[PDB]
Every structure is written in C-alpha cells, then in structure tokens.
Amino acid sequence: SMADEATRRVVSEIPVLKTNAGPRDRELWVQRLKEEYQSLIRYVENNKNADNDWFRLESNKEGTRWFGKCWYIHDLLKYEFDIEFDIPITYPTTAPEIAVPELDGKAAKMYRGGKICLTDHFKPLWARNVPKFGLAHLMALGLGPWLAVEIPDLIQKGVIHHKEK
C-alpha cells in the first residue's frame, strides 16, 4: 500500500505505454517507440515545469541504443554525467540496464563496466507494471533515486569534484 502510493505519486502524470514489442518486432516496435517518445517528451516537459529538467536522451535510428546526459544538483552546484543503455531483445518485460560510464570503479552501487546497481525493489516494481512502464519510468524510478543516494555519497567522500565553468 505505501509502495503503490509512492509509485503513483512519482509517475501518475507520465503517459502510460501499451505495446508489447521489442527491437526485433518490426511495425509493432515502431509503434512501441511512438509510445516511448511521447511518454519521454511529456516527462521532460513536466520536469521543466517543476524546475527539475534533469536529463536529455537520444537514440539511434532503430531506437535500440540510447545515450545522453543527466544533471544532479547538490548544494546548488550542478554535476553532469553521460548515460547510455541498450534495449534488451525481451523489452519491455525486461528492463534496460543504465550505465553511467564515467563512474565505473567509483560509485558504490555499480557493476564493473558502469551499469548502476539498483535496489531489489525496482525490478519487481517494473515487473508488476509490464508493459505500462517505459524509458521515462526507468529514468524516474530507477536512475533518479540511484543518483539521489550515490552522487551525495561520492561528493562527501571526495571521489568526484565539480569542475569550474
């Protein structure tokens, strides 16, 4: 009951997705990508309205490789990190694995190679919502909360530093 409400508070203004298609699924994958792009751009617009415009993403032509940037504010300073992920063949039932490559070997909750290690509650949360969640939800429920623990830890520990601009 607390988990269901917390999830709704975060995602209730993100458009819900519908199509069960992954990268190999041809016209159904093009349809899934329309849903993904429309959910993502609404999430970006909502974030701008809330003074929390915290990421940009692009894909390759086929929509199977995603990359961009996120920004995290701590003590009013803005920290930028490059992000990337591949769409699993079994998407959207399987969730993508976000990587923050510059933090490889630095962040505590991270696999060798730069994939973030999310708490055990994200996977079953994604699983319980299939196929309604997409990349906007991956950002809002997966990377966002990861940054809000790991980036303050790394700044406190002196592992990362703000470069003058």
Side-chain angles (χ1 to χ4, degrees), residues 68-77 79-122 124-129:
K69 299 186 167 162
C70 71
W71 293 278
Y72 187 81
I73 300 168
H74 193 251
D75 299 339
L76 292 178
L77 294 176
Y79 295 76
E80 182 284 335
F81 309 95
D82 292 357
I83 62 173
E84 67 189 53
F85 55 89
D86 173 61
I87 300 301
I89 301 309
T90 54
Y91 188 78
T93 300
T94 299
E97 303 177 296
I98 295 174
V100 187
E102 65 202 79
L103 295 184
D104 183 27
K106 301 184 183 182
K109 290 318 194 70
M110 178 172 272
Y111 304 103
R112 293 141 135 105
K115 281 170 181 185
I116 70 180
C117 183
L118 298 178
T119 78
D120 277 355
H121 280 81
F122 175 79
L125 178 60
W126 181 273
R128 160 186 14 249
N129 282 286

